[PDB]
Amino acid sequence: MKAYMFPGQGSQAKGMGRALFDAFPALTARADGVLGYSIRALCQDDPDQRLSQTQFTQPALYVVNALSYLKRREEEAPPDFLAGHSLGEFSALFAAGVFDFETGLALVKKRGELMGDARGGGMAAVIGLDEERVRELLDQNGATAVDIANLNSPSQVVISGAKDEIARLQVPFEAAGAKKYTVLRVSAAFHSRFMRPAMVEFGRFLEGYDFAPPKIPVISNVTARPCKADGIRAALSEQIASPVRWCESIRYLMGRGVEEFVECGHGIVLTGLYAQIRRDA
Template sequence: RLTHTELAQPSIGALTAGMYRLLENAGFTADYYAGHSLGEISALWAAGVIEDKSFYTLVKARGAAMGAKQKGDPGSMLAVKAEIKVLEPFIKSYKDVQVANLNSMSQVILGGGTKSIEKLAAQLKAEGLVAKILPVSAAFHTPFVEHAHKPFAAKINSARFKTTSKKVFSNTTGKAYENNVASFKSTLTKHMLSTVLFKDQVENIYKDGGRIFVEFGPKNILSNLVKEILADKEHVSISLNSNALKDSDVQLREAIVHLAVLGMEVQNFDQFQMDYAEPVAKGNISVKISGNNYVSEPTKQKHVQAMSQITVRSAEPKIETKQEVVTNIEEDIEMTKQDRERLDKLHADMDSLKGQQDRVEQMLQQLVNIQQAAIAPFIQQPIAPLEQTAPPVAAPAAAPVQPVVESIPVPAPTPKPAPVPVAAQPVAPVVTPPVVTPEPPKPALVAEEQIAAPASTSTAANIEEMLLTVIAEKTGYPSEMLELSMD
């Protein structure tokens, strides 16, 4: 709501007065005083024509009068970037449109009926001119604010004015006020319905000797207009609050430094400045206190409750699924960085060990496949018996005859090796010397199942020794420490 006319005008007046009073107390003085629209009341106050109480009464009354709702069309305003002589032919086509502000050589503000302004804006844009309708509540400085003129004029007549030794230039005439109370009141009364001749005003101040222009109030609109009006002339234009997006305190101080460089005696303007103190050395555990450090009581309680619980995962003896058990503990448990690093390393080692275990299983499977491939040619043809080298062994009559064969050792069932780190490398087949078993002299064809069944004790021992030796070579563990029963 601060942008509403009834609030915006007294707010701008208060800010302008505060800025001026601050610099005045620091030694600032001016030779000429002028304003733009509402700013003319501030200029009369700064020059000493209007007292403090009357000043605040007038800016409030002006905002209330101009912001009051009225019947009918309140009018609109159009900003056009063009010279006045270019716009005059267009303006003559509309009876309810007139020049509200003559701001510079190339900036003119028009005011009038809303429909006429909208139509004129489209017409000017079609001609290639920059035209923008302003977001205002009424067509100021035109007959469309006649409703505000009468109540504001009454406030002017009741306010206390006095003469001054300073020169104050008027928007209405573009010239200096006559130094008498009647002139001040009559000119200010007509001001609301009259065109703002800011361009003429600045040019006349320059002709009278003004060279340094200081803008009091928000933004830098007037400073930019002065720069445009006096573009080819020697001058300085300073704004105390040029950018609404930047730090206002920094901008104010920079402007005051600029004035000091130009020779203006403005010292000790900051009445709230603190004495300089040497910074205190910070300790090793010092913490900067700010709003970020604050923790509300409900948040603290949530932290305490969260820290009083820990999630434990347990597995049933013969079930692979895991169940979460939430256990309350009285002491806070905190895992240090070193403990976490150890835990992460342990997990990595377990993953590596599992991978190595899988590779050992692959190697053993390859060994079995090689042995089976070596046996396959012998089980497809008859096997001739060898000469008997030992006395025959008596056997039951019903027992089947066993042939004498040159057998290839067949590995016994391979137990799962122990989970030890190994590197995946190809394993060469190991063949033990053939074992000759004395049998009766009658030959017979042997089925595949009969060959795979018998295995001598020495062959099984050799296979076990060979496997343990391979695992020992790959893992670095002594074979005496290894057993086939290990997981």
């Protein structure tokens, strides 16, 4: 069986989507209508240097991912499962028929606004340490204001929390065997307790939307299991303050018999994570 994987923040690049805007001109124009600016220009030229800023990145990735999905639907057999990484969940839910293109874009416009306006904390991407070792290091070094934000592969974990703690933890993490420890340029400590205020505000917005049952199963970042219709609204706000269980989601799919994992959107970030999960699993 086959799964499509939808990428999120950090996977964007100038030039993303270039062929797709002309292939789907009505949807591109409708996105411009929702956003108030040219999505083609943002992705192709980034003329205001804001493609890196999540209030803009989130819509850019959602549009590129959605159009990439529509192109794949035109060209190949349908996927058996869908999974998206954080912002990518919205793409996955669109592909599953949970909401339509414009509705998903409204939700991500808001999500990006709220996350870009959040402040408090920071994040670091760590390569080389497993989850239990990361947990041990947080405990042993007294970093009580740091949470695990992403579980991406057996050796790839993102931590999130107090900026001072994120900075000082580089030393004990490198001493333990972190091959790379990268402090991210982000508005706040995403996927941590620092996002509780934004989570509440996003939940209030999501109350105004309905979520149809998925027509193709979507694996949740929160539970690492297929989404249930009645739980989607709540999960989408919880997600921003909760760990992204990506590694587990992919292992669950492998256990279901998925052998083909295809990234739907720009770049090969999720494909790289898959290779590391496969090698361990």
